[PDB]
Design a protein around this ligand. Sequence first.
Ligand SMILES: Nc1ncnc2c1ncn2[C@@H]1O[C@H](COP(=O)(O)OP(=O)(O)OP(O)(O)=S)[C@@H](O)[C@H]1O
Ligand SMILES: Nc1ncnc2c1ncn2[C@@H]1O[C@H](COP(=O)(O)OP(=O)(O)OP(O)(O)=S)[C@@H](O)[C@H]1O
Lengths: 342, 350, 99
Amino acid sequence: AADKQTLQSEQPLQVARCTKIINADSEDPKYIINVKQFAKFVVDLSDQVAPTDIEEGMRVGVDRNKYQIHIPLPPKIDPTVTYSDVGGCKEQIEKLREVVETPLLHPERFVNLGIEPPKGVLLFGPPGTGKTLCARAVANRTDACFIRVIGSELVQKYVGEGARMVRELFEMARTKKACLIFFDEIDAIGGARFDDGAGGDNEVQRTMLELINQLDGFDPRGNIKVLMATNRPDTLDPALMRPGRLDRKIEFSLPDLEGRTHIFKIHARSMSVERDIRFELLARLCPNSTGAEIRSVCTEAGMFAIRARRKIATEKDFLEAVNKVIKSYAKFSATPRYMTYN
Amino acid sequence: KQEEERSKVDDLRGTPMSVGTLEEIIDDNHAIVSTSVGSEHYVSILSFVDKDLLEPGCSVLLNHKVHAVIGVLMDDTDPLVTVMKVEKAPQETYADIGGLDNQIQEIKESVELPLTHPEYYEEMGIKPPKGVILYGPPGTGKTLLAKAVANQTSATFLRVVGSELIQKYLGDGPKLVRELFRVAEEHAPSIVFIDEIDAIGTKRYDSNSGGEREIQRTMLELLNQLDGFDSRGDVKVIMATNRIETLDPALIRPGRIDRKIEFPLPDEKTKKRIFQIHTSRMTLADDVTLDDLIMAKDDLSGADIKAICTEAGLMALRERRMKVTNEDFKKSKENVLYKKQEGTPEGLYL
Amino acid sequence: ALLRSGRLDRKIEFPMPNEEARARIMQIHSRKMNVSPDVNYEELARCTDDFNGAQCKAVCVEAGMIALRRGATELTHEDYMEGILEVQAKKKANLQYYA
Ligand SMILES: Nc1ncnc2c1ncn2[C@@H]1O[C@H](COP(=O)(O)OP(=O)(O)OP(O)(O)=S)[C@@H](O)[C@H]1O
Ligand SMILES: Nc1ncnc2c1ncn2[C@@H]1O[C@H](COP(=O)(O)OP(=O)(O)OP(O)(O)=S)[C@@H](O)[C@H]1O
C-alpha cells in the first residue's frame, strides 16, 4: 500500500482509448479513426490538445463518450527495427569510389562542369557476392559510420509505422556526418504501384512515397550515402529512376578465378591454417561458387581441423573441404563414380 | 499492522478482475492495457505490486470497470512447460551401435564437441552451428537420435513437438514462443529439440482463426525470436522433419540454420543387424532366413523392421506359438506394407 | 479489339532518330553541362548508326562520365566518341569458331 491512497484518487481521472489514426480532412483537424475491430469514424478533437501532432500513422487518446482526441505519443515504438581487404570485385570499388567519394571530396569536377553530383547507386548482383563488404568498405574513409537495414524489418502491422521508421532513419541521418545506411530487399519496400480495387498492402505504398520524399527532393542529402541492393532493376519506380538520383548501376556477378583466390587469401588469413599451402587448385575446384561458400569451405576445412587436432591446415584439409561441399554436400555424394573421362 | 495495508490493497482491487496483453513501457507508472479484444484506457498500476518483474508486453491482472493494472500474472502452467522442460535424462543413447554410424559421428562432433568443449573455436576462430535440420524418410531414427543426445548429454535438454504451438486463441502461440524461449534461455547451456515442423506448413484447422494469418504470425515470432537478436551465444537448438517442401526458405538460409543433414535408409549390411536386434529379445525357430526380408523391401525404414519383427511374433503368439514360422513372416510383412510390390520390377536384371 | 477505331483512334509510329534528331537530343542532354565549342554534332550523331533515344541519353551521359574520369575541365570530343565507342552497347563476343 505504498501509494494506495492516491490510487483511491485516480478513480475520477481516467480517459484515452487507443484508436489508431487513418487520415484527416483538409482546412481543419477533422481526423479519421478506426478503433480496433468495430468500424471506422471521422473524428474531431478535444480542445486542450495540439492539432499539429495528430498526424497520420499514430494512435491518439480518445474519450469513451465523445471519442474526442486526447494526447498521443508514439504508442508503437522501439522493437520495430532489427577494412583491410578493400578489394573484392575490382571494377566496382572504383565506380563506388566515383559515386561516393567524388561528391564527398570535391564539388570541383561536378558543379564547374555543369553536372549534378551522383548521389545514389543501384547495386545488382547475386546474393553472397559481397554487397555487404563493399557497402561497409566505403566506411573506412568517410569517418567510421555505418548502419545496416534489411527491407523486411519494416514489415510491421500498423499504418505508416514503416513510414515512421523512415522518419527515424532520415532524422538520424542528419544528426551525423558522412554516414551510411544500407538498403536491401527493396522489392517488398516497393517499386511498382500495383493496384486494383482491394486496399491491401498500402503501408508499403505510403512508406515508399515517404521514401521518395525524404530521399531526394526537399532538402537533399549532403554527407549521407545509402546503397540499395537487389537482383533486379526491374521492379523499381521511375520516380527514383528520375535520372539524377540512382544513375550508376554498378555491375558484378560471380567472381572470375582470381577473385576466388583473393577470397581464399581473406578467409585463410583470418583463421588457423598453415602458411605453406596453395589455393589455385581449390580455385579450379570452384567453377561456380560464392565467397560466402568460400567461408563455408574454410569453416569446413576448420571442421576437418577439429576432427583431427589441426591448427595448421594442410592442403588436404581444404581438399576434403571442397570435396565435402561441392561434390559430397552439393546434394549427397553420387554425381561422380564413373571414369569415361580420365 | 500489515493486515490493514493488505486489506486496503485487496480493496483497491474490485473482485471481478481481468487479464490483458500489453505492448510497451509507459515509464511513469500510468499504463494502457489491451485486452484480448484491446480496449485501452490510460490505466494505472496498483503500486505495491512489482511492475519491474516483467519485460515489456506481457499479461498482468486487470480490472473490468476502470481497467487498471492490479497484480502480476500467475506463472501460468500451460501444458507445454511440463513437456518442454525435459524432466529426466531419460534412456536410449545407444543400446545397439550399427544403425547409422555416419551422422552419429557428425551429430557428435557438431553438437557435443563444440558445446561440451567450447575451447576449439579459441584456436581456429570458427562459429558454432546454431541450427541443424536432421531429416529424411519417416521411421529412420531422428526422434531416436534426438533422445540419444538427450540422455548422452551434459546440457539441459529440451524437447518440443511442432503441434504444441497450435492453439485457437489470439496471440496464444506467440506467447508460447515467448515462454518457450524463456525456457530455452533460463536453464543452462541447453539442447533444444524441435520436431514436426513440416506438419505446420500446408496445415489449416477448424479450432482456428484466419488460417494463413495465424501461424504466419506464430512462425514469424519464431523467426524474430530464434535466430534474430537476443544474442545467440551457446544455445543448442535442433529441428527435425521428414519432408522439406512446406519449409519457408527464410528459415532455411544461413545465419539461422547452418548444416543440412539427411539420413539414408540403410544398406543390407546394417539391415542384418537391425533385423537381428529387433529380433534379439524373442523366441524364434532359427531355421528361417531373414535375408529374404532383408533383401526384399528396397526402401525400408526401421519402423518397417520394428513392425515386421514384432508382428511376426504377434502372428505366431496369436495362436500361442513361441517360435515363428516363415509364412508368419509372410503374413507380417504383407500386413505391414500395403501391396509389397518390389518384385519384377525387378526381379529381372537378373 | 484493343485498337479498332474508337479504342485508340490513331496509329502513330515513331521514326528512329534519323541523324539530326540524335544530335538534337544529344545536345539537349548537353545543355546544362560545360561544353567546349569544339563539338560537331552532325559528326557525332552521324557516326552513331542504329542509336535510339535511350542510347542518345546513354552516349551523352557516358561523354559526361568518361570526361569525369580524368578530371578534365569540360567535355571533350574524343569522350563523346568513346561514349559512342562504349561499344554501341553490342556485346561481347567470346568469340570461338568464327576464326
Ligand atoms: N567478392 C568478394 N570478395 C571478398 N569476400 C567476399 C566476396 N564475395 C563474398 N565474400 C565473402 O562472403 C560473404 C558474403 O556474405 P555477406 O556479404 O555477408 O552476405 P551477402 O549475401 O553477400 O549480402 P547480399 O545478399 O549480397 S545484400 C562476405 O561477407 C565475405 O566474407
Ligand atoms: N540404437 C539405435 N540405433 C539405430 N537405430 C535405432 C536404434 N534404436 C532404434 N532405432 C531405429 O530408429 C527408429 C526410430 O524411429 P523414429 O525416427 O522415431 O520414427 P518416426 O518417429 O516416425 O520419425 P518421424 O516420422 O520423423 S516422427 C526405429 O524405428 C528403429 O528401427
